[PDB]
């Protein structure tokens, strides 16, 4: 496992040190349909002429990014994405910029968001939630081993691929960092207490997040919810959580170690790192290697009657794309 990780690190480091830039242009693609909206910008299904390949293109308006004070986070997102490599991470195929916009061309993942299936079906069975949760575990282990904090886990950001496996998308809040950082970002339902309390935090906020996610998948609703974020924060910070009476006792014990407001004893943050989680009883039947190799059979395989069909995604208002004749925000995004 070490030689895996150790070698993963050397590869990321070389890419991180000298990122790829300008690997395409908007002309080489045809616009088909808007697939969704993430942290910032829009993502559209596109077709790559020269190859006939379908991709998902994230487009960000440079001026809007500057307005929201997201420049550094945006540069983070591309620099990190061009550098990582993992089965459960959506792959970035190219990136480029024009006078107006930043572009990030990613693998098209046709099964849609976990979000859509979860809400439609209600909640997942424990073995079902375990299969998903394992892939996130391995993914955070990869990411944290490179000093990366994900900071935006939610079912909206988890796509289901043709083999029924998960791919994580939207690195808008991802950051390579040693030790602590302070930005107030993420999704209210998923925020760790240390974050809402401006205490300063580290990668343990991600393991809390996995807690929220396992709960939401198993229950059909988040541990902390309410009409407004403000009420949501009061409940995250209060040291209390209720479990549906169908939750197995092991699952409850896991969740108690994950939604641990005490950084001291929060699972994932102890002496044994991720192994504390990997070894919990709830994961007793989880075959960590077979899952990394996708040899494990998925619970659910999405309807897919086209290489470029979009019915597993909701429809969105289709917004035109405007490319200035004048360059915008040149110096800000020079490294993009």
């Amino acid at each position: 496992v070490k030689e895996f990780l150790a070698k993963a690190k050397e590869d990321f480091l070389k890419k991180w040190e000298s990122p790829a830039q300008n690997t395409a242009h908007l002309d080489q693609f045809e616009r088909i349909k808007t697939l969704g909206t993430g942290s910032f910008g829009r993502v559209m299904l596109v077709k790559h002429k020269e190859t006939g390949n379908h991709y998902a293109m994230k487009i960000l308006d440079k001026q809007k990014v500057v307005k929201l004070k997201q420049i550094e986070h945006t540069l983070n997102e591309k620099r990190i994405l061009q550098a990582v490599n993992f089965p459960f991470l959506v792959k970035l195929e190219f990136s480029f910029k024009d006078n107006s916009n930043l572009y990030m061309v990613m693998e098209y993942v046709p099964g849609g968001e976990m979000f859509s299936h979860l809400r439609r079906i209600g909640r997942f069975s424990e073995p079902h939630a375990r299969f998903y949760a394992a892939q996130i575990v391995l993914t955070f282990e990869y990411l944290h081993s490179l000093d990366l904090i994900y900071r935006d886990l939610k079912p909206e950001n988890l796509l289901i691929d043709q083999q029924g496996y998960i791919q994580v998308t939207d690195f808008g809040f991802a950051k390579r960092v040693k030790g602590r950082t302070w930005t107030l970002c993420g999704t209210p339902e998923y925020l760790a207490p240390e974050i809402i309390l401006s205490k300063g935090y580290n990668k343990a906020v991600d393991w809390w997040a996995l807690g929220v996610l396992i709960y939401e998948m198993a229950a059909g609703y988040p541990p902390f919810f309410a009409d407004q974020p403000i009420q949501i924060y009061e409940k995250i910070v209060s040291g209390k959580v209720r479990f549906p009476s169908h939750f197995s006792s092991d699952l409850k014990d896991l969740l108690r170690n994950l939604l641990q407001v005490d950084l001291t004893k929060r699972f994932g943050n102890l002496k044994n790192g991720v192994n504390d989680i990997k070894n919990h009883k709830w994961f007793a039947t989880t075959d960590w290697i077979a899952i990394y190799q996708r040899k494990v059979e998925a619970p659910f395989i999405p309807k897919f009657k086209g290489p470029g069909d979009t019915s597993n995604f909701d429809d969105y208002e289709e917004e035109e794309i405007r490319v200035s004749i004048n360059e915008k925000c040149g110096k800000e995004f020079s490294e993009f």
């Binding site: 909206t37 942290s39 979000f115 809400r119 935006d152 939610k154 909206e156 808008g172 809040f173 107030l184 970002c185 993420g186 999704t187 209210p188 339902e189 229950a219 059909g220 609703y221 919810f225 309410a226 009409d227 974020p229 209720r242 549906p244």
Partner: peptide, 18 residues
């Protein structure tokens, strides 16, 4: 039920980041 409260709440859609 907690599920009934969630389903009638304003946060069963796609949730934006802060």
């Amino acid at each position: 039920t907690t599920y009934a409260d969630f389903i009638a709440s304003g946060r069963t859609g796609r949730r934006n980041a802060i």
